[PDB]
mmCIF file of C-alpha atoms and ligand atoms in Angstrom:
data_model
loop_
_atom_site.group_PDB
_atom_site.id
_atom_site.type_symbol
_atom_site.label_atom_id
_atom_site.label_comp_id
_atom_site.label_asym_id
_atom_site.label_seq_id
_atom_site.Cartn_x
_atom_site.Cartn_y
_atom_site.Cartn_z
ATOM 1 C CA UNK A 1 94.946 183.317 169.946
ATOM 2 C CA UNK A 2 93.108 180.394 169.350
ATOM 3 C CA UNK A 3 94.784 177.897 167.171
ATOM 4 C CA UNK A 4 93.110 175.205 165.323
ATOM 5 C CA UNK A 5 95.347 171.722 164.540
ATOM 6 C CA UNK A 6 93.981 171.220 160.663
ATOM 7 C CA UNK A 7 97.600 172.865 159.855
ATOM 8 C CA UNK A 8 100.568 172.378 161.912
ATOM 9 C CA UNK A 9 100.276 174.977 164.865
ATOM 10 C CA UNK A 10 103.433 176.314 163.428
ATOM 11 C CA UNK A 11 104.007 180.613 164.657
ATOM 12 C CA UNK A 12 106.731 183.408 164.334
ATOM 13 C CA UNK A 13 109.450 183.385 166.958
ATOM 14 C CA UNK A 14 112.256 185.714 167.364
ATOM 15 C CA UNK A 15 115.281 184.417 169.302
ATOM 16 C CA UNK A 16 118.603 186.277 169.999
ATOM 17 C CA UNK A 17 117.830 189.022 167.486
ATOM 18 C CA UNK A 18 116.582 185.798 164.604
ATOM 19 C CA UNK A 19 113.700 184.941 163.057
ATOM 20 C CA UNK A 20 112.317 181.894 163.288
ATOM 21 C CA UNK A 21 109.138 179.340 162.751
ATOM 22 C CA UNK A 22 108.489 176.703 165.262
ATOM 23 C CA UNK A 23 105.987 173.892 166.344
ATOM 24 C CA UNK A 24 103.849 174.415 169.422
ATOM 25 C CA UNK A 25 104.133 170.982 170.482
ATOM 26 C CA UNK A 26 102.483 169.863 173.381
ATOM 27 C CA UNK A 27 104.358 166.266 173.506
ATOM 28 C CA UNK A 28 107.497 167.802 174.270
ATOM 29 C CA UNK A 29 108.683 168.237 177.202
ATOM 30 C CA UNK A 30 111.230 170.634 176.205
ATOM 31 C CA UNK A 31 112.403 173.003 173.798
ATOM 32 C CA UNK A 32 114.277 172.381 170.646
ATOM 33 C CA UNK A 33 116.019 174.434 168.373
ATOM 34 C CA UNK A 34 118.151 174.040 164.707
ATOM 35 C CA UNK A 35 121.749 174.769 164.822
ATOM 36 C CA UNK A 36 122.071 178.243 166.031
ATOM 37 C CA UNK A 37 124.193 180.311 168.455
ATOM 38 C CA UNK A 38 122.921 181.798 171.777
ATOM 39 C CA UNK A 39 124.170 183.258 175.096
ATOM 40 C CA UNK A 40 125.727 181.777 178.554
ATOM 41 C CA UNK A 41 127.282 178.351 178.849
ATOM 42 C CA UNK A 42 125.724 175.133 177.545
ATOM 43 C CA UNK A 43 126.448 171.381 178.813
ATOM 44 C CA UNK A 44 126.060 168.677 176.320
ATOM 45 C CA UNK A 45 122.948 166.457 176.718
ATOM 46 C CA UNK A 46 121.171 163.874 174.467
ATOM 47 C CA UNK A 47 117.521 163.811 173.944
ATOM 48 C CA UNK A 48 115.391 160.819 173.106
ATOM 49 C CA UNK A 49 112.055 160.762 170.655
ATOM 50 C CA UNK A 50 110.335 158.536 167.929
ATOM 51 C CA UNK A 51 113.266 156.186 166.614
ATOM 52 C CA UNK A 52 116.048 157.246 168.485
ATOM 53 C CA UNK A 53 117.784 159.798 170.014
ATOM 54 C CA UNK A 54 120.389 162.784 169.125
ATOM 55 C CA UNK A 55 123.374 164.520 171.317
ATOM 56 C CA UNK A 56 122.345 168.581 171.749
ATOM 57 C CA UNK A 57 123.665 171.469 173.704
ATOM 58 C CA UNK A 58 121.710 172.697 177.192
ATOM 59 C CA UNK A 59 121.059 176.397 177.301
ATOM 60 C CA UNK A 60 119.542 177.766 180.050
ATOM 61 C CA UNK A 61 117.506 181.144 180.954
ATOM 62 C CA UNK A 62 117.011 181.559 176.881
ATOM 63 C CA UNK A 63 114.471 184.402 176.054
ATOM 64 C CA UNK A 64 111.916 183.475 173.362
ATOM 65 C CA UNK A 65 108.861 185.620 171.803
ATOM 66 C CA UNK A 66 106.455 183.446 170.618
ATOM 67 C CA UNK A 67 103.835 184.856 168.583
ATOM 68 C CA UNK A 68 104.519 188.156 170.761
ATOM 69 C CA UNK A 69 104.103 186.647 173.971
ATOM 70 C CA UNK A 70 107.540 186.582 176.051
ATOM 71 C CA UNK A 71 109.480 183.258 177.951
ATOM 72 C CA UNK A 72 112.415 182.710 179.093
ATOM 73 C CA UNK A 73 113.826 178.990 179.710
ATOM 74 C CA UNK A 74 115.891 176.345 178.849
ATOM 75 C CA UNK A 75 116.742 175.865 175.098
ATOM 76 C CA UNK A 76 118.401 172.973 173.421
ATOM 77 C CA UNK A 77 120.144 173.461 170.224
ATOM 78 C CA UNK A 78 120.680 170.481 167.955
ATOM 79 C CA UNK A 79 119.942 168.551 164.782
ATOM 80 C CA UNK A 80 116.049 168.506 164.906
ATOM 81 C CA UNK A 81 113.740 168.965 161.606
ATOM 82 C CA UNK A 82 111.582 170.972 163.190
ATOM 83 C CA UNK A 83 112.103 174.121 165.892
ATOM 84 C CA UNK A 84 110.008 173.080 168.960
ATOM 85 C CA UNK A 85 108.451 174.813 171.329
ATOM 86 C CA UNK A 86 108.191 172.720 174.414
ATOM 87 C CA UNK A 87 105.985 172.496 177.540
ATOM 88 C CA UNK A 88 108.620 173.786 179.181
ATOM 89 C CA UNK A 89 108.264 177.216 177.551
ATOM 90 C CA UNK A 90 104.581 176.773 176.540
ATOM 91 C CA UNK A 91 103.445 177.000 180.143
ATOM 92 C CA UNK A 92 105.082 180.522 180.559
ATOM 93 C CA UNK A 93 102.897 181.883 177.849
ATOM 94 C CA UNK A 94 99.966 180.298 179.319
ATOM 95 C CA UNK A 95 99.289 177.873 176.394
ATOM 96 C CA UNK A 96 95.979 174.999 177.275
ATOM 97 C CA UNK A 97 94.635 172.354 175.221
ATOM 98 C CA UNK A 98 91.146 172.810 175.076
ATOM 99 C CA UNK A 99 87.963 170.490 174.002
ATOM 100 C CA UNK B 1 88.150 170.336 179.275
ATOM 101 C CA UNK B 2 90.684 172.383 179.317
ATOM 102 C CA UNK B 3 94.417 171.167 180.061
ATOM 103 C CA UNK B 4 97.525 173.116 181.279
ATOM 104 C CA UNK B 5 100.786 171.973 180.412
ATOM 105 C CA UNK B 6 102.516 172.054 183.689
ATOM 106 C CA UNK B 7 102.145 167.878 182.983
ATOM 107 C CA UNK B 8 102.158 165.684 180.469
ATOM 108 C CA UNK B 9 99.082 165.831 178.629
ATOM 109 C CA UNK B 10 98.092 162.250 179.406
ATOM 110 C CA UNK B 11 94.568 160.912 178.413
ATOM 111 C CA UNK B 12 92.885 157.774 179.335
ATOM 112 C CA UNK B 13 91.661 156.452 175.892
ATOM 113 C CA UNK B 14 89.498 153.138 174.676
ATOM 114 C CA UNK B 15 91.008 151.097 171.286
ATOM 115 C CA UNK B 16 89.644 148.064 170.662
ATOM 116 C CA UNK B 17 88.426 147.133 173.672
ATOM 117 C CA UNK B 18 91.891 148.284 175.500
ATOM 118 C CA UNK B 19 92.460 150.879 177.965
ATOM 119 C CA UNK B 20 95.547 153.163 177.343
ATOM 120 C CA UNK B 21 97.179 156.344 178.394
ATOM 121 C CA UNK B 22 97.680 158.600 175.454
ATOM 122 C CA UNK B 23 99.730 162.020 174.815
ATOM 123 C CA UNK B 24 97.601 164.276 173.097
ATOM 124 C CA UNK B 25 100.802 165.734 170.735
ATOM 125 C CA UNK B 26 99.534 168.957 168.674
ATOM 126 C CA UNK B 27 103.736 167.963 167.209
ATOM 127 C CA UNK B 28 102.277 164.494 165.898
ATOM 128 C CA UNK B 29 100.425 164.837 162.324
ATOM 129 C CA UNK B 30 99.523 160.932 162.955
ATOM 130 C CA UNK B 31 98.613 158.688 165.517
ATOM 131 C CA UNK B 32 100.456 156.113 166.816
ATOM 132 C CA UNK B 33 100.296 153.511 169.504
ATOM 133 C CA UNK B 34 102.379 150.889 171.044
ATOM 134 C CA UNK B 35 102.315 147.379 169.608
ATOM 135 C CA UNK B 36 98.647 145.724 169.504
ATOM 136 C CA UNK B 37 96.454 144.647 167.190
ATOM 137 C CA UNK B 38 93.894 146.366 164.831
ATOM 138 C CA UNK B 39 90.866 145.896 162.623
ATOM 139 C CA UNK B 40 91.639 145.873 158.865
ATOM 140 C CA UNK B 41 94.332 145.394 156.689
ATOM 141 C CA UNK B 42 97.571 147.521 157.370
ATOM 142 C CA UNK B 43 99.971 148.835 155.179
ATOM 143 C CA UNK B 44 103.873 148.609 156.483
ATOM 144 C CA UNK B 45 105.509 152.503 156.315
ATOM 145 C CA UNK B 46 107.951 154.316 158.237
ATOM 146 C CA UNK B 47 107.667 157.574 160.385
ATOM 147 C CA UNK B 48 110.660 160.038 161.391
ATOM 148 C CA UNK B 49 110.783 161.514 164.565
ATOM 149 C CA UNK B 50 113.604 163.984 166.205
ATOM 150 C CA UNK B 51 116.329 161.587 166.680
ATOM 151 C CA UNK B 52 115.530 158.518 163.791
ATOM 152 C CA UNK B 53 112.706 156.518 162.144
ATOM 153 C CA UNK B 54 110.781 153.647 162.974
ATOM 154 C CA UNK B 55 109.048 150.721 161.199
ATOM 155 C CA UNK B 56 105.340 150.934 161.684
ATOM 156 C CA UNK B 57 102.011 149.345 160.436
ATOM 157 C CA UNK B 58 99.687 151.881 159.304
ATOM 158 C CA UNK B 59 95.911 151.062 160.352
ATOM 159 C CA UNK B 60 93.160 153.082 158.355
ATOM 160 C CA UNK B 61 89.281 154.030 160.089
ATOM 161 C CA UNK B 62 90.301 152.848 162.951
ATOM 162 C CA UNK B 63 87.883 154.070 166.119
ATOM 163 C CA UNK B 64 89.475 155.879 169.239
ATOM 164 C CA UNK B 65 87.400 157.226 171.995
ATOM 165 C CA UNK B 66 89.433 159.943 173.911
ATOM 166 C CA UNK B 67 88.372 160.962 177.148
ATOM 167 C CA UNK B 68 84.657 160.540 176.301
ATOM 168 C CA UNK B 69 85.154 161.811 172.854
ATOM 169 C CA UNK B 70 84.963 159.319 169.672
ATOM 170 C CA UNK B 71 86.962 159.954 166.639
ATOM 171 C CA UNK B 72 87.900 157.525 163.568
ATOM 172 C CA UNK B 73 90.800 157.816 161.733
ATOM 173 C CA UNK B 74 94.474 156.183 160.972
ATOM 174 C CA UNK B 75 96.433 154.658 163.725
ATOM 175 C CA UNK B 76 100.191 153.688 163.219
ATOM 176 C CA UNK B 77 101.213 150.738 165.496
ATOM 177 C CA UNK B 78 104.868 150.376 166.189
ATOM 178 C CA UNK B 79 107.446 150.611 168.854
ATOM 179 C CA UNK B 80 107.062 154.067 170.406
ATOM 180 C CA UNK B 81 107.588 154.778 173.849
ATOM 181 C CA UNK B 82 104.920 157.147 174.334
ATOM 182 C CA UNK B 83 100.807 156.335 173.070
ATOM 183 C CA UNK B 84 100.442 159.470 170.531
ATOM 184 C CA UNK B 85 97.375 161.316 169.365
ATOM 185 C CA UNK B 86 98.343 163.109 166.501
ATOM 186 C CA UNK B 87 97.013 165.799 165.072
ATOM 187 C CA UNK B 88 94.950 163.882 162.615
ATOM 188 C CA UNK B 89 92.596 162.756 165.758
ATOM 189 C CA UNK B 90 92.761 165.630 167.464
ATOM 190 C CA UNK B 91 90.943 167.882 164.947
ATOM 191 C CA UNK B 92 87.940 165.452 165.334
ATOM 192 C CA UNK B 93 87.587 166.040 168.925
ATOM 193 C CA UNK B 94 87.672 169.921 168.428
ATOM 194 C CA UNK B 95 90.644 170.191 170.234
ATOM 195 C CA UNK B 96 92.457 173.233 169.964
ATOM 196 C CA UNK B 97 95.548 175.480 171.417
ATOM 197 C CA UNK B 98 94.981 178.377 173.283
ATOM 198 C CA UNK B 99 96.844 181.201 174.596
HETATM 199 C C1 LIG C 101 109.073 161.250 171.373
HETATM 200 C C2 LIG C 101 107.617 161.835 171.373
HETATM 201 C C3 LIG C 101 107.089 162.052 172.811
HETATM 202 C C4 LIG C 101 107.446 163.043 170.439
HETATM 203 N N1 LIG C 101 108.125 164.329 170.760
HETATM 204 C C5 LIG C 101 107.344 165.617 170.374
HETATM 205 C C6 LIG C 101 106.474 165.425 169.086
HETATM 206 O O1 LIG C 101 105.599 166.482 168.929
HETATM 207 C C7 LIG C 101 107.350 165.325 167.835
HETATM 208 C C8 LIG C 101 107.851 166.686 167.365
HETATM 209 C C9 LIG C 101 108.497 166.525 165.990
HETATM 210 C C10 LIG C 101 107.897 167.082 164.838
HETATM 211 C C11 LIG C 101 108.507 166.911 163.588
HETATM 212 C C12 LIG C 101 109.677 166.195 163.488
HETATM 213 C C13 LIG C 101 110.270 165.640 164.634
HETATM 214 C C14 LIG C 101 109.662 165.809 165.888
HETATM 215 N N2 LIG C 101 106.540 164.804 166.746
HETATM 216 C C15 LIG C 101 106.563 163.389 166.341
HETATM 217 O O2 LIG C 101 107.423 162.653 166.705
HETATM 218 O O3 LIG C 101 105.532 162.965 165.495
HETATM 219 C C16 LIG C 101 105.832 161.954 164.555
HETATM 220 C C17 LIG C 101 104.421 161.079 164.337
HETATM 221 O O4 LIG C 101 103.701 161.847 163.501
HETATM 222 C C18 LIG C 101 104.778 162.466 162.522
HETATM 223 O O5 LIG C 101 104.601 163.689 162.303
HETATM 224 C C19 LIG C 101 106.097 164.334 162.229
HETATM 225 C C20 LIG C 101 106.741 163.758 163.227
HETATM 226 C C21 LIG C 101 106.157 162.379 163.328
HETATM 227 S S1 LIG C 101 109.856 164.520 170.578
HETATM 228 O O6 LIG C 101 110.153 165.235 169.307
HETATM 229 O O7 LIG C 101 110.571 163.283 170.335
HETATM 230 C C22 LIG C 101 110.608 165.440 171.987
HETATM 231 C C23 LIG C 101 111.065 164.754 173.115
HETATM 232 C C24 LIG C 101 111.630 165.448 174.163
HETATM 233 C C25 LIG C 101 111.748 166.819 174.100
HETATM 234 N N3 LIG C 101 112.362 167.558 175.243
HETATM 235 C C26 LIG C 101 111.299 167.502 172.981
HETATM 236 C C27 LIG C 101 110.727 166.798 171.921
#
């Protein structure tokens, strides 16, 4: 689809069986989740963005559908206030900014 | 143009004069910049990001011209790491996501 940025580019995701809204955001570098549980081991990691930065657990080889399309990469589960889809998983769905 | 995501999406952009990198962020509703100064009087606010908040002085009409492409609008200065253009910016330019 082609996806306008009037209204946060917010879509439909389903994650380990949940239901979930996130932001396709092209400034991040990776992918960011609310407090959730998922598959395989995870290694704490801390994340930096605008005023600071917060202490989240790695996940690796995560599936995501996104708006229907499928990806599979790393996911980081933390306190964010906002589900993020980063570039990292963007790229596998073949996402472009375009102007 | 058309940008993959395989990068940062850095863009050369001209404020005031100035020469700057910017991260066109379809996650950023505003823009914001690193410290410099702006036309206008400014109003001191405060934006949230994923791991805190940060003072910031919020410039209004405020001319951008993004690779090639001139847009007016607000423009937060403050101490970011990264040169944002948010969403409010972006729509000018037409720029949209695609997948
Ligand atoms: C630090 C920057 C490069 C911004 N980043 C992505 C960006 O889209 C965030 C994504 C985002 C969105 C909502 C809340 C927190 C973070 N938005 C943001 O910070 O924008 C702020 C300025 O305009 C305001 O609009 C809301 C946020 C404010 S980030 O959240 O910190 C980030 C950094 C690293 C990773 N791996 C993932 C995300």
């Amino acid at each position: 689809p082609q996806i306008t940025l009037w209204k946060r580019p917010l879509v439909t995701v389903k994650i380990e069986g949940q239901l979930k809204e996130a932001l396709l955001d092209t400034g991040a570098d990776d992918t960011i989740f609310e407090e959730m549980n998922l598959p395989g081991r995870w290694k704490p990691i801390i994340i930096g963005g605008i005023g600071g930065f917060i202490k989240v657990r790695q996940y690796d080889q995560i599936l995501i559908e996104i708006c229907g399309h499928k990806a599979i990469g790393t996911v980081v589960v933390g306190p964010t206030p906002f589900n993020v889809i980063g570039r990292n998983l963007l790229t596998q769905i073949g996402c472009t900014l375009n102007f």
